[PDB]
């Protein structure tokens, strides 16, 4: 809506286009840079006691 040249100027990040450096707010460190809990805090505190929270990857 603000001009075709404006959009490509705003969506442009790197002069060189042969390097992939995706945007990240932060970088993970724990668990060899991974996530152990991929659930909400309520699911975090309830899945340890209550059944029906884990979908049983088989």
């Amino acid at each position: 809506v603000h001009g075709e040249e404006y959009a490509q100027k705003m969506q442009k990040r790197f002069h060189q286009t042969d390097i992939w450096a995706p945007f990240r707010h932060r970088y993970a460190y724990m668990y060899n840079s991974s996530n152990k809990n991929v659930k909400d805090y309520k699911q975090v505190t309830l899945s340890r006691y209550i059944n029906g929270f884990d979908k049983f990857n088989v």
Binding site: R24, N32, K36, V38, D40, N51
Partner: protein, 92 residues
């Protein structure tokens, strides 16, 4: 006469205490196991006990279910106006 040897009879006095201790300890361990074994249909290994490749395979489906579908099906009016949304995978 077929009585017990004297050294054995003295130490036999403490045996019922050992028995009740074993009963209580077995109950404690069994309750811990059962509480752990109910939500997960098996005794789940600790996440940090697996290799780097294993850690990705065990959490891929949960990532897809919790963060991929709501993002690929996102609409501007889907979000709640109360600002209490689901938290990011990495907290910044």
């Amino acid at each position: 006469n077929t009585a017990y040897p004297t050294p054995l009879k003295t130490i036999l006095k403490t045996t019922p205490a050992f028995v009740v201790y074993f009963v209580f300890g077995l109950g404690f361990s069994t309750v811990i196991y059962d509480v752990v074994y109910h939500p997960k249909d098996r005794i789940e290994r600790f996440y940090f006990r697996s290799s780097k490749f294993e850690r990705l395979s065990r959490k891929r489906d949960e990532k897809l279910r919790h963060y991929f579908k709501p993002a690929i099906e996102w609409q501007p009016w889907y979000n709640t106006s109360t600002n209490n949304n689901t938290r990011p995978l990495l907290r910044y």
